[PDB]
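During the second half of the funding period, the structural biology subgroup turned its attention to how the target accommodates small molecules. The most pressing case was HPW, which had performed well in the primary screen but for which no bound structure existed. We therefore specified the complex as follows and requested a full 3D prediction, including the ligand pose.
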Amino acid sequence: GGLTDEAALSCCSDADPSTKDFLLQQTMLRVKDPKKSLDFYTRVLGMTLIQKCDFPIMKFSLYFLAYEDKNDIPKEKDEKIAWALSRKATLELTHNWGTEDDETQSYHNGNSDPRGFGHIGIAVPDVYSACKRFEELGVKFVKKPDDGKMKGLAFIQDPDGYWIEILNPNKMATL
Amino acid sequence: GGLTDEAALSCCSDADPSTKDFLLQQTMLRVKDPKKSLDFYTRVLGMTLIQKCDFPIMKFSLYFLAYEDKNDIPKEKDEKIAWALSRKATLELTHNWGTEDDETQSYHNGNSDPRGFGHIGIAVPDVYSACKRFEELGVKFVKKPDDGKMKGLAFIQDPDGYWIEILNPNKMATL
Ligand SMILES: CS(=O)(=O)Nc1cc(NS(C)(=O)=O)cc(-c2cc(-c3ccccc3)cc(=O)n2O)c1
Ligand SMILES: CS(=O)(=O)Nc1cc(NS(C)(=O)=O)cc(-c2cc(-c3ccccc3)cc(=O)n2O)c1
Ligand SMILES: [Zn+2]
Ligand SMILES: [Zn+2]
């Protein structure tokens, strides 16, 4: 069975003062091809590339994507890193160099064995108009808004096959 | 081997106005034992349980954790879900009923084959003092701040073994 509301609450503690000012900053996903992923997250989902970091010795790049106004990106290099890495709710895309040329390589989306991570989710004003546009742009759907039991909730996928929930918090079905 | 800054920006499109109110709302992780996870995220990391959702027919519960003040959680039941699911940067923890009692069962953290998801990251005022507390609390580390390729950043793990990065944005430029 599931936990009762009371049982859940008994497992929770109040925020220790040392965790003052902690924020949830990033979620990292590995991406096979950064060209494809950048196009998807910026053109399809409307996110902005706020920081790109390269590490030539270690042969990887990090791309930080966020719902931020491109005009708020600082001009100076050091000021830019501090700003981008202090934004709430960023997506960190990791490019291990060479993966895009390896035909036998792909990443795993966590939705088949072995499972773990499931999805990121984007809150939108209207699930139907958002998905209508996704269809016109040829986006791959795991679940269209009105497919199955739960109406008004969708799952799409990115170029690596990671699932992205599309939800309207104002129009969630009753529990 | 990686993209140039210019090549990267050439794959970026400006955010479509139809996307202007979109926000990155949630990252979903499956959890074996919700009691242990709730303890970790609230007591260790200082998050707040902002919404619990139970689905008795589908035999799962969702736990939404965020860095929010519990006083901002609305009184009205329908107003609550709309508030909780419109917060940026939440963690959705999924309990599939029965996993806590099954010895053969565990989730996969994405950092060994097959890889995909990597981590969530928490921005903190002071990586070293946060980690000193984590050690005191018996937290399992993947990377202590002064270990590994880069100093000043840490990785810890949650009860399921999911990796959590601990970073101070204001010192990232100088690592
Ligand atoms: C719409 S569905 O039932 O066919 N699929 C679905 C699946 C999952 N996760 S799971 C059990 O790992 O597969 C969560 C949800 C889900 C429900 C809800 C939700 C919350 C409150 C009311 C109604 C739905 C929020 C949310 O973020 N997610 O991901 C939906
Ligand atoms: C510090 S370490 O090299 O020993 N570990 C480490 C590992 C990874 N991921 S990866 C390529 O999958 O192994 C990212 C980072 C990392 C660096 C940075 C970063 C950004 C700007 C300046 C310095 C570090 C940000 C970030 O979010 N992450 O995750 C650090
Ligand atoms: Zn990271
Ligand atoms: Zn979800």
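Two results from this model are relevant to the next phase. Chain B touches chain A through 91 residues (CB under 8 Å). Residues A 26, 28, 53, 60, 62, 81, 92, 94; B 118, 121, 148-150, 153, 165, 172, 175 surround HPW (ligand 2) (CB under 6 Å).
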